[PDB]
RNA sequence: AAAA
RNA sequence: AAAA
RNA sequence: AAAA
RNA sequence: AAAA
RNA sequence: AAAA
């Protein structure tokens, strides 16, 4: 799923962390139009993420952005994410006009938003990542470059909501992942660069299979297997790794 | 209250913010002699800023400077305000002179000094101005540059001592305000240029009155009443404004 | 607020004395047409004085004005206030035709009327007075040249019916005080030039700080305050006054 | 409470004097129409005064404005007191029509009436706001400028009849003690400009509180406590009045 | 009342909150030369704070200060009470000389001592507010706003010592209100700014005037009736509310 | 602005005196066609006087002028004062046609007439300007012969009706100073050669500037300053007249 | 105000430019004797701009015209500002003789000085031309060019010190705008030939006078007012344009 | 009239 | 065979 | 009239 | 009329 | 064959 950022000039501070968090967790990102580029793909387009701040009411070109964002919101392309830098109590609302005023509380009661708080940023993280992905098909946790047995490997793990997909799941998805794989290693991409790659997470077996195809000649694979709890080597791009050799998890 | 800066040129990188935020808190300000200078106006003279640092101490001109004003503070004409931008504890007294260590230990327990801390910036000079604003009559707080209900305006604050003020208070003031108000938007003053200029804060009639009437063919006046906590403006020096439209606070 | 005066040539000894009067109780007056001068400005245009005499209905021109002005009054766009040269038994009602003593009825029985009497000219010119505010907003009283403390001074006392006022109130409020100080000593004004101007009876900050603000470079201001009930000074123009000054009241 | 006087012209001399009484007893007093001044406030509008006399029933014009009073009174929105200038037995009923007869005849019957003797001006006064009170709430009693251990007073006393109120007594209280205080002191006032005010007779705490409250800088408020039968000084406003000193009354 | 804070600034971080629980309970607090300021105001000028705390009698300058304010103690213009922040077992009386051990011991038997702890906050917080209560008048217990009937409202409990008054009492007392209630909703103080204060607990009829009257044009005004026991508006400054409401308990 | 006079010979005598009173009042002036002349420079050409006289009721050839006047007066370029040489009880309608007397009828009701007595000469040329200039911008008074501390002086006093201007009235004014100037002694203008000019009347600087600016190298300038209420020397030209000097009027 | 300046050749690199900003102040400059022109003009003779420098202490016919300077200058006629080429620190006072050295250390310190250093042209020259009025009246910043709405145009801008001047003050100044006045294009001035002039800041009606005349025939001027804040055209000596346009700002 |  |  |  |  |  693609995302589009909104949000004011002064908090770059507090964006792209948050920005970067949701990149390791294999959501696409566009941070700088905005709103031409919603029509773009798929009904499951992307959510607005409105970083609402008290500075970010004081700039009209924001403003614009978020009436358009939500006038073609109720036609259901996209739906609006929009997270308070500050808490609810100390949004400054009079400075707003009235109908800027009742179209802000609007928004606010009938949408669910989410707090933000810099000096707690791990539930802070964790809220936003669990709203973008809370109306979605199966999760996508963020990367974690761990080492098992000696051997180095980052761990692609994704949960499934309930238990079951639809069948034809894959012909509406938008999560292509060959253009989150680095080409080189200063570049900075979810998956590192001739880094050994795990996938974890049960599921059906045509989802392993739509993940892995796309590694070929890109990174060595692996897959966990729940019989034994243990990950197991497909493909062998490197040297010192044979396809089908275990790592004890 | 105009003051005089009294400081070496090493601390010059922290005496500007200083300053800075004091002219906003309408105070009058004359870094560039300093002792010629304390003899003019009203016996209410000013109020000596010595920034006093180990680097400050080991000047002899810096010194003599510090000397005179201490010498006609005796008189009553000034009182001096000691800034310690490093801690007491540190300060290398050892250097002085037995003549110059016992006359500078004279001011510092006699006389009350400000301790100054660069990494608590907001508290440290919040308490310059506490000391500023100590032995003074009513009190200015720095301005703020508001928006509300869609209209952007300067507020100017001010706390009474007490609860009132000798009648002929107007008498023996030397705030003239029509110093602090920009002319041009590039050079800066406490005033803005055009800006709407707003009063709050309890205070009585007439000192209300000696306040906006200076203001005329500068800015639009704002004034806050307590019967309905709303402002209310006086004078429309701008178009879009009319005298007495009601501002929601 | 204005007003527009109808009269007969033979009572023109008596109108401007009324005309003065009401000038030096700060209110505008038209005497030299009428009836396209109505509408102009706010709904609260003018009171129309009917100086209802026994020539007064001896002139058809006079009639017709009249005539119009009620037909303009049904709408309440202007109120009529009728004062009576004559007494009402003694008014010549035989003369005028069936229609004109129906509608000279029809006004004098279902609105109130004003009687005047030259004997009494206290009475009579307050009564005249008392029927332009009995209907408005904050009162005004006449400028009085009072000397305090062998300094000469001019009130201006304004009683506020209610103690209430509204918070847009001003911005329906017909005056520009401007235009009732004198640009000459020669010139007939309620405010006379450079001569000092005091503000008297309770009312509130914004009130006092409307009143004042247009006599800078004009007048030297003066305010009561109850606390202490003596007149302030609040502007510096002429030479002697400084702002500051207090005078027993 | 308010009141609209209805009286002859013959009658002018005596009606301003009763009119003087009872507004120093705090009863709000209209004389210059009447019948639209009814429709405002509360159902506690005012008393009607009818000022009967000879002279005043032989008049068409103050006979219709009874008529229209009594005809609403009926509705009970507004209670009429008859006051007799001329005793009933001397009433110049002949003249009256029939209609007009038997309808003065049925009111002074039904409702009423208080005898009016210019002789017995003390005994007559006080019926009249007796009449005034009988069936109204907490009753006042006229100003009284006395002097206690030197000190000049106006002491506002006030009676409870049945020493129980409603305990929501102050939502439906339309009298407002801001209009009955003296802006200047050649002002006709109940309460006179400058002088301090001392409250009587006994009451629940919160009645004094809604009574002294408004008199915060403007006038010196006294209250009389029982404990000591001495009165307390509770506002500080004139020179020497410190709020505390006692007075033995 | 005034207080006077003497303290370390390693127990700084613990002070304010003792200060902060005291502004609440409407006593004037002065932290930060104190020596000078002993003599200002009427003999009951304030109590001495003397926070005694193993950190606090190893240094110099705090020492001497504690010695003044014990010699003038003696004279009887203030009245000290020590806070122990240690428990007095473990206080390091080896470290002090001779004379200053002999000082510290003279002071705690003679003189009443508060313990204090950190664990049971809420209790330690009340012994510090009964010692100060203990030879005060009448009290004061800390700003509570509880929310009746669904308006928002703060109590300013108030309890007397025994059961009655000096007839004089009030010219001697140093709280005068005003200065306790907040100007702006941000700023920190007694009474919120704008929010409406209530006034609870048994008294003459003259202390409750005295409070509330100088809250006209500040907040609104709520005074207890304890015959039926509800709360009885007698200020109106904020819409929708009117005086005469009652606020069941 | 420009004035045309049609008349008959009958008044010359008194007409070239109005006409130089306009003069004074730093009216342009054309004497001796006219309506050919009418349509020339700006919509606000000039004023028709047309000065009503019965012998020039007897002149067909000054008939005719006013007939082509009206025409183009309805269309706006030029508006129509008619000055009545008698009144308008005798003037000779009679002897005019029907057409004639249909004609004036309609201008003397519809469109105001200027009243002239020879006996009343102040007063009538006063009404004369108060016609011109009612329906103008900024009036220029007639300009006098002033003679203050030893200085002969001619001033220039003007009045802002309404006490402000279009910000773009400079554009617009058909007002040259150049022409109103003598080159001679000898020469008729409204300022006189050589000597000494001054500016009075507030109004905006740039108002001040236009005015004097043609004044270089032709007179000496003066303008009134309101803050000490003295004249202030701009320009040597004349012999001893340097700039700055200070003239107490 | 004049200028006289003292250098060494070396030094021609620097005084030139320092001389060029200086002329574009509105400073006439004579740079090349000296010491006899002092005695020409008023009072205020000019500001001895004296380049100390290392060289410049090397030679002597430089010195003894700096002696005369100071020597005179006990007498008042000129005042003396001293530029520090270099910095005081390393200033060769050992190779100065005895006499010329104490010479030397009395002028630096009773006088103000001006440090100057390459690196920092802007704060070097504009603490130049503050030193240059601090002393003096109503200051005059450097010509600057700024094309508005298409116009290319000049501003000259002043500000006055304080808040009023003398009213005589014009007597006594030194700033005749005639030799500051361009005519031809390819010379320099501080005045553009041909190109439009505007006036900024606020100050009096005869100040904006003075200014304005010497421009006729010579320049366009514009006003600007403070009341809309856009600059007016009052003279029109270029094509295309005719006195009364408004330039937005 | 010291929560009437 | 889209870095085999 | 000391945020009426 | 001291940027009206 | 939905971590076999």
Redesign the pocket.
């Given at each position: 799923p693609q995302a589009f950022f909104s949000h004011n000039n002064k908090d770059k501070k507090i964006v792209l962390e948050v920005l970067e968090h949701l990149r390791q967790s294999l959501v696409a990102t566009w941070i700088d139009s905005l709103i031409q580029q919603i029509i773009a793909g798929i009904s499951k387009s992307q959510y607005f993420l409105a970083f609402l701040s008290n500075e970010y009411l004081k700039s009209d070109w924001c403003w614009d952005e978020l009436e358009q964002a939500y006038a073609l919101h109720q036609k259901g392309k996209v739906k609006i994410i929009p997270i308070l830098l500050t808490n609810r109590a100390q949004l400054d609302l009079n400075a707003l006009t009235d109908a800027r005023r009742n179209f802000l509380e609007s928004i606010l009661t009938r949408l669910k938003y989410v707090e933000f708080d810099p000096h707690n940023m791990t539930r802070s993280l964790g809220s936003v990542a669990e709203a973008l992905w809370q109306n979605e098909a199966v999760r996508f946790e963020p990367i974690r470059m761990i080492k098992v047995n000696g051997t180095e490997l980052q761990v692609v793990?994704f949960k499934?909501p309930?238990?079951?997909?639809?069948?034809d799941?894959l012909h509406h998805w938008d999560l292509k992942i060959?253009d989150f794989?680095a080409?080189?290693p200063n570049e900075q991409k979810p998956v590192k660069?001739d880094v050994p790659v795990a996938?974890?997470?049960?599921?059906?077996?045509?989802?392993?299979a739509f993940l892995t195809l796309?590694?070929?000649?890109?990174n060595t694979v692996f897959?966990?297997?729940?019989?034994?709890?243990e990950y197991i080597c497909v493909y062998s791009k490197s040297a010192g790794l044979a396809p089908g050799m275990v790592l004890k998890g």
């Open positions: 793990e499934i309930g238990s079951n997909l639809p069948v799941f060959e794989i080409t080189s660069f996938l974890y997470g049960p599921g059906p077996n045509w989802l392993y796309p590694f070929k000649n890109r897959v966990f297997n729940s019989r034994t709890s």
